[PDB]
Amino acid sequence: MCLKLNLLDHVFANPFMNAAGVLCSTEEDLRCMTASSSGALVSKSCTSAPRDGNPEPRYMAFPLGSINSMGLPNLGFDFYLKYASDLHDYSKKPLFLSISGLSVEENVAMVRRLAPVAQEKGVLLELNLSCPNVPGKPQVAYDFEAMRTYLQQVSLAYGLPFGVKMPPYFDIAHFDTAAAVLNEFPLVKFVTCVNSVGNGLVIDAESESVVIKPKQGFGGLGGKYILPTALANVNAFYRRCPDKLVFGCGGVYSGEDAFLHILAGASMVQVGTALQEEGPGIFTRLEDELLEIMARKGYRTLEEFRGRVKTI
Amino acid sequence: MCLKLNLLDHVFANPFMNAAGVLCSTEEDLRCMTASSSGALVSKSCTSAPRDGNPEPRYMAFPLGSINSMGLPNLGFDFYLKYASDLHDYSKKPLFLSISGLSVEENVAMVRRLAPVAQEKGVLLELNLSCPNVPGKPQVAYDFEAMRTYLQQVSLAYGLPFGVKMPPYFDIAHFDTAAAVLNEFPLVKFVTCVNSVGNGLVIDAESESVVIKPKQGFGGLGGKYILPTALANVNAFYRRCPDKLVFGCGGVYSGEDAFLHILAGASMVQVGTALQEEGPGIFTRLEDELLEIMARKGYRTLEEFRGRVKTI
Ligand SMILES: Cc1cc2nc3c(=O)[nH]c(=O)nc-3n(C[C@H](O)[C@H](O)[C@H](O)COP(=O)(O)O)c2cc1C
Ligand SMILES: Cc1cc2nc3c(=O)[nH]c(=O)nc-3n(C[C@H](O)[C@H](O)[C@H](O)COP(=O)(O)O)c2cc1C
Ligand SMILES: O=C(O)c1cc(=O)[nH]c(=O)[nH]1
Ligand SMILES: O=C(O)c1cc(=O)[nH]c(=O)[nH]1
DSSP, X not given: OOOOEEETTEXXXXXXXXXXXXXXXXXXXXXXXXXXXXXXXXXXXXXSSOBOOSOXXXXXXXXXXXXXXXXXXBSOHHHHHHIIIIIOOTTTOOEEEEEOOSSHHHHHHHHHHHHHHHHHHOOEEEEEXXXXXXXXXXXXXXXXXXXXXXXHHHHHHHOSOEEEEEOOOOOHHHHHHHHHHHTTOTTEEEEEEOOOEEXXXXXXXXXXXXXXXXXXXXXXXXXXXXXXXHHHHHHHHHHHOTTSEEEEESSOOSHHHHHHHHHHTOSSEEEOHHHHHHOTTHHHHHHHHHHHHHHHHTOOSSTTTTTXXXXX | OOOOEEETTEEESSXXXXXXXXXXXXXXXXXXXXXXXXXOEEOOOBOSSOBOOSOSOOEEEETTEEEEOOOOOBSOHHHHHHIIIIIOOTTTOOEEXXXXXXXXXXXXXXXXXXXXXXXXXXXXXXXXXOOOOSTTOOOGGGSHXXXXXXXXXXHHHHOSOEEEEEOOOOSHHHHHHHHHHXXXXXXXXXXXXXXXXXXEEOEETTTTEESSOGGGGEEEEESGGGHHHHHHXXXXXXXXXXXXXXXXXXXXXXXXXXXXXXXXXXXXEEESHHHHHHOTTHHHHHHHHHHHHHHHXXXXXXXXXXXXXXXX
């Protein structure tokens, strides 16, 4: 038994990949993710120009997860586009390129240049509408009119299939509205739930200090803290977007956690905090563990249980 | 060294109290909370008429916290008002009465009747604008226009100092907007941050099932999961509402957790999931553990470190 699957006109050896931003900023990082046993990789969310990002320290990890305010440090769109167009070995695994412009105009500029490379190479766009860490730039997908504008302008400029990285929601009315907006756009073929839980605050009792420097210590949460939130969002969008794929991200540390994401409706399963902490070896462990749970339960395929979470 | 506080024209032996909804629905519960070593108690959020609440199972706890969709089961406003009027021993500790009407009209009806008892007995109103569990009723405070309407109508009808139980926010823009709305209302003397993190989803891997019955398994999260979110909200409103008090709620299991809430700006510290799990003996443990930390750090009173979290 193997975990191989086909989605979006691509073949994947297994449903696992890095979460955007983790192990994917440099050529070295991307080569490492490519050499791993992950089913795919996604690049660091990029901007038109290179960015140094927010002041350090800007990432910290703890037993229950992580906090980060990286601030989109990246080598610039020119680099990630070149990686996609010239450097990536597509025979190894599919590539997603994540973009996170600070305005609709910036995103439109990037997708116009990404289009010919998508046509030639089959690189897949993930549009990031949920960065919670750039000072003075609120999460785009928490403003539904802004979200509609971005998706309208990107659909028109790009003209090819793409996906969206969504922030977590916490209100049924918000699930209803956000999914309704997404469903207006046939080019949106996948929905990644979720980005980090925005603007949490970790304080160290001994030093009586916040643990990251940017934004007075406020940063996005990942890891064990966020698993039930992530599962909720995966399932909410799975239920509301029956003609799209949902990719799960948030709180994955084991094959069991991946199993839950898939039960909730996840097609791909992304790994952020756990990958940052454990390194790319995690992918062999996650595949082994997921296969073990499937064997124990008598499942032969992911399709057999994807989205089949039972209600009471 | 002491944990004493004087606020809202009342005296509190220590900052600890139950979180609304935990150990406070029946006369038995309220008597139990009164007999405990807590500095205060709050009653179950009530509605005009008694409510059975949502179908069971509707609460489940795990190592990292809890999920609930109780659905505001309560004995009705008449009961809680009578408890406050006739039954509560104010010589033991102060009492807060939480109300969670399903409309502004319902809330107004209740506060009109509460006002004479508040004037007579000194019972303190907590207005719940953040219940995430009644099907078809999104959190009031996620709609800032609705929030303003509720606070306008309740201020006018009540005419006495009161507090508001707030949902968690995840966006700096939302902290800014929510605090600005609150600051329009001089009668709002305290802000309790936070209610449960709404509409999470816990799935059991063995049974492949959600663990609570209402709303297809979607329920509010409390406990370990939510501490950094709770601290963020406490500090955000502490910074933005310099003329109000902030009460902390979320993820408190230890004196250390309480210490962090207080560093973030909390006056009172409420205990939900940990109290539900451990029972009212938790209050003597929290007192001992907070005093232990204070002793080690040379702090003699709460005011010496309240709101004194350091940034980098
Ligand atoms: C160091 C760090 C950097 C991240 N950078 C990005 C980013 O560039 N783009 C993005 O969409 N998400 C980014 N994320 C969010 C993750 O992709 C993921 O959505 C989140 O961490 C939750 O998953 P987890 O619980 O596995 O960490 C980043 C997270 C962290 C830990
Ligand atoms: C069983 C249950 C019932 C609750 N009922 C109420 C309620 O009636 N009114 C309210 O404002 N919050 C209610 N809450 C939310 C808690 O007051 C608290 O805000 C939340 O559980 C987070 O705190 P914790 O992390 O200590 O659990 C309830 C929580 C649970 C666990
Ligand atoms: O670069 C970052 O700060 C970052 C971006 C993003 O989308 N999500 C996140 O958690 N961090
Ligand atoms: O009764 C409930 O379901 C309830 C109310 C509330 O305000 N918060 C919560 O977590 N549960």
